[PDB]
Amino acid sequence: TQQPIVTGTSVISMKYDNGVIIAADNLGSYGSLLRFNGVERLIPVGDNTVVGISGDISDMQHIERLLKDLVTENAYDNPLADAEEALEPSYIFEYLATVMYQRRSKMNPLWNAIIVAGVQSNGDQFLRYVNLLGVTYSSPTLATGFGAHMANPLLRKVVDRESDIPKTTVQVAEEAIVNAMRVLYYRDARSSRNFSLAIIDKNTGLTFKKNLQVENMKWDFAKDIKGYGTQKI
Amino acid sequence: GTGYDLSNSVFSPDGRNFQVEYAVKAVENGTTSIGIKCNDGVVFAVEKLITSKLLVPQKNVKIQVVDRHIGCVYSGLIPDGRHLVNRGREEAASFKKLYKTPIPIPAFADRLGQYVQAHTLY
């Protein structure tokens, strides 16, 4: 039983016609202190899988190296680690899920919320979520923290049911994610302007964009806001 | 008298360990394998005896990888060689886990060396 120290806010993501997108800002907060601005919280495993982690950052780093060990060990005595017996998004998920529920069951959680995103070998999109309780679920859109409350409603306006997915393009998908990241920056007090975004497409493979900034913000109307009621100047 | 070669950790009267020397005979009965150290790396090659046409090519892999940067190959009793690699793997993980840097080759050599030596002690 612990309490988180250095933290990362929302991870948000959805799936479109050909694959998935997942985004996360580059910040580790220390309570109210915005302490670290270089934090990469999207962990790519292979080239069919990105793993976005929110929650305690020491526990994330631990999980992060578990993933490397998992790639090293897969490739032991395996002449097919670069095809057919390469790591699959669902394998990486079931493992994490297993560890999460086990740590919860030991009363010593890995204080995180994880979203596993990628494309399976057959071509199917993978998108699933596990958290520090070992609770798991899938939806065409997924998000942790504030993202759950503010990002999901925006994203569900694009992909509101499974039948909407083959209709949604990468441009449309990528659009939504970026707007959502901006809304989060407007309204989440533990968030950051700088963020990373990854697209895993069944035909373009893994595309990983670092050092993105929130752009196109509306702030102008702030000049007209005076007082909190009766003040005119 | 006689019988110095029956138990593993016994010094013969000339100071030798016959069980080790017998093990060496099992190596010699093995297929041949080599390593060539070049100017920026190492090559490993091995002889795979094709007993029959029933074998599958090239589906009986003998060379093993430890961590991500170490190749191992061995001659002799094969299951013994896998057991040793297994131990090398745990050892290299344990090293990375604590020290972050992947195990340097001499460090790694000593890891197997101390462990092989250990089996000539009891």
Swiss-Prot record, chain A:
Key word Transmembrane helix present: no
Nucleus keyword on record: yes
Description of how the protein assembles with itself and partners: The 26S proteasome consists of a 20S proteasome core and two 19S regulatory subunits. The 20S proteasome core is composed of 28 subunits that are arranged in four stacked rings, resulting in a barrel-shaped structure. The two end rings are each formed by seven alpha subunits, and the two central rings are each formed by seven beta subunits. The catalytic chamber with the active sites is on the inside of the barrel. Interacts with CIC1.
Compartments, as annotated in UniProt: Cytoplasm; Nucleus
Physiological role: Non-catalytic component of the proteasome which degrades poly-ubiquitinated proteins in the cytoplasm and in the nucleus. It is essential for the regulated turnover of proteins and for the removal of misfolded proteins. The proteasome is a multicatalytic proteinase complex that is characterized by its ability to cleave peptides with Arg, Phe, Tyr, Leu, and Glu adjacent to the leaving group at neutral or slightly basic pH. It has an ATP-dependent proteolytic activity. PRE3 and PRE4 are necessary for the peptidyl-glutamyl-peptide-hydrolyzing activity.
Additional detail: Present with 16900 molecules/cell in log phase SD medium.
CDD domains membership: proteasome_beta_type_4 (cd03760)
Extent of the signal sequence: none
Species this protein is from: Saccharomyces cerevisiae (strain ATCC 204508 / S288c)
Name of the protein this chain belongs to: Proteasome subunit beta type-7
Keywords, comma-separated and alphabetical: Cytoplasm, Nucleus, Proteasome
Native organism taxonomy: Eukaryota, Fungi, Dikarya, Ascomycota, Saccharomycotina
Swiss-Prot record, chain B:
Cellular component aspect of the GO annotation: nucleus; proteasome complex; proteasome core complex, alpha-subunit complex; proteasome storage granule
Major place of residence: cytoplasm
Compartments where located: Cytoplasm; Nucleus
Superkingdom of origin: Eukaryota
PTM per Swiss-Prot/TrEMBL: The alpha and beta forms are probably products of the same gene with different post-translational modifications.
Keyword DNA-binding found: no
Gene Ontology MF annotations: mRNA binding
Annotated keywords: Acetylation, Cytoplasm, Nucleus, Proteasome
GO biological process: proteasomal ubiquitin-independent protein catabolic process; proteasome-mediated ubiquitin-dependent protein catabolic process
Family, similarity comment: Belongs to the peptidase T1A family.
Record note on quaternary structure: The 26S proteasome consists of a 20S proteasome core and two 19S regulatory subunits. The 20S proteasome core is composed of 28 subunits that are arranged in four stacked rings, resulting in a barrel-shaped structure. The two end rings are each formed by seven alpha subunits, and the two central rings are each formed by seven beta subunits. The catalytic chamber with the active sites is on the inside of the barrel.
Comment field (misc): Present with 12000 molecules/cell in log phase SD medium.
The protein's role, per its UniProt record: The proteasome degrades poly-ubiquitinated proteins in the cytoplasm and in the nucleus. It is essential for the regulated turnover of proteins and for the removal of misfolded proteins. The proteasome is a multicatalytic proteinase complex that is characterized by its ability to cleave peptides with Arg, Phe, Tyr, Leu, and Glu adjacent to the leaving group at neutral or slightly basic pH. It has an ATP-dependent proteolytic activity.
Protein name stated in the entry: Probable proteasome subunit alpha type-7
Organism this protein belongs to: Saccharomyces cerevisiae (strain ATCC 204508 / S288c)
Source taxonomy: Eukaryota, Fungi, Dikarya, Ascomycota, Saccharomycotina
